[PDB]
Amino acid sequence: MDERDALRISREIAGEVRKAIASMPLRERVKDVGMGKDGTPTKAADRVAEDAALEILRKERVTVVTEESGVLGEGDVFVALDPLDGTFNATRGIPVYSVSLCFSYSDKLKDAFFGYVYNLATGDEYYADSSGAYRNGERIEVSDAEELYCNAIIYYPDRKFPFKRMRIFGSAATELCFFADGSFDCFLDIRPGKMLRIYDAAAGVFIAEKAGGKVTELDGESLGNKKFDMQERLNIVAANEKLHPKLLELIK
Amino acid sequence: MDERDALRISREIAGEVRKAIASMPLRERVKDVGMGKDGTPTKAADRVAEDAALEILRKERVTVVTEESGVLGEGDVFVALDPLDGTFNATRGIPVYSVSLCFSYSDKLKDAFFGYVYNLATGDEYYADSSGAYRNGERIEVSDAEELYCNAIIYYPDRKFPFKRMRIFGSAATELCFFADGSFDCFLDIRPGKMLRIYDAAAGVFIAEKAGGKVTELDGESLGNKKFDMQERLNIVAANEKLHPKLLELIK
Ligand SMILES: O=P([O-])([O-])O[C@@H]1[C@H](O)[C@H](O)[C@@H](O)[C@H](O)[C@H]1O
């Protein structure tokens, strides 16, 4: 299965999902539909989003790990998918919530060949493959801000940082794409509770990688080990090559 | 002048400035076109939207307090104006930025008689008159649980909080409407080195209060006798009556 397969496939889910959510009223969006396979509740929006993706991913020889219903599939290709990363905003009318998909051969991130995040509010498309990282087509790349005094996304500010700006938009998959497109110089989820799963960073992380930004874990150990599994958790420190180090040191 | 004209005038300015920025590519958006009369530099998206905004207000008998052109016109009626709140977003294509407008029968916040916030990204409309606060033509109210374990907007987390969620979206006018909505449980701008100006907040402040909100300065002092000029600087703590005291002590 080509990257062109993954892209073609990915382009279908986003649209299917988009109008499934779009048609959905905020009132019929926030109600809970049960308990997804990862411990967290499940809103209607959640269900509707995942179904539309599964119905298409379903026809592909792929094993999928996803929030609402753990593992599914069998294929020799794995998908770390999130129908709706940023469910709080979506149920709020806040226009920052996306579809996340990452395509890999093996069980682990290291063998992933395609990244794709789609903002379902705006219709903004984020993707990456061997060719590169794009947003709405135009080629992107992380920023070259070399100063700790810079624009940042931080989960969560706990001390007093030397940041020019600090934002928190509530959709890790999308904000990693904000880091990816140079709109932001560093992504940071140093949350002690290590409350970040694979179907969250998977897609985002990989586009960031393509866009030219170094991305690892709290200490610096890569994300490679990471598995398309329901137990996997993580923290992230993302920045170009001249920022990541200093950004590490600053959180000791 | 009454709250019907303010709406009608505001609705027009919302149309033109919307037209203005939308057709305008991002490249130009980020363009430095000189310095504004307040320090915070003027970029093309700024200039483009003030221009559009000013072009309408000025043919009314009012004194305008705007970001770039300082104070303008004459009239017992005052208008605090943020022609583009969330410039950084507007420049990067992050769909949170608005046009903020507050009208008062005095230069005093306390005499405000109309408030208005328009998401230039989603065409989402917030306003507040004598009848109540509304969002896209619907009546909003603030949220209601006194538990600190709530959903907060806070500029900036310097310590450790008992909040369920912390978001910073970079447009205080709209964010104060996010609070006024129900979307977020509390708004807080406790930054010591104060940076909120009358125009970024007087509208939100006014829509939130009609929303059922309690906005006061850091110390719980009302924002009533707050002046419309390029010197005022604010700190804000907004929430329902019940959780407001709590937040004071929390950040006490
Ligand atoms: O809640 P969700 O919308 O499914 O996804 C959330 C977003 O990625 C958020 O940015 C992150 O910090 C949270 O940990 C995730 O749970």
Ligand SMILES: O=P([O-])([O-])O[C@@H]1[C@H](O)[C@H](O)[C@@H](O)[C@H](O)[C@H]1O
């Ligand atoms: O610059 P501007 O976009 O007009 O207004 C800014 C926004 O309201 C932002 O939320 C706030 O944190 C800044 O302090 C303001 O300067």
Ligand SMILES: [Ca+2]
């Ligand atoms: Ca999700």
Ligand SMILES: [Ca+2]
């Ligand atoms: Ca998620």
Ligand SMILES: [Ca+2]
């Ligand atoms: Ca402005």
Ligand SMILES: [Ca+2]
């Ligand atoms: Ca402003």
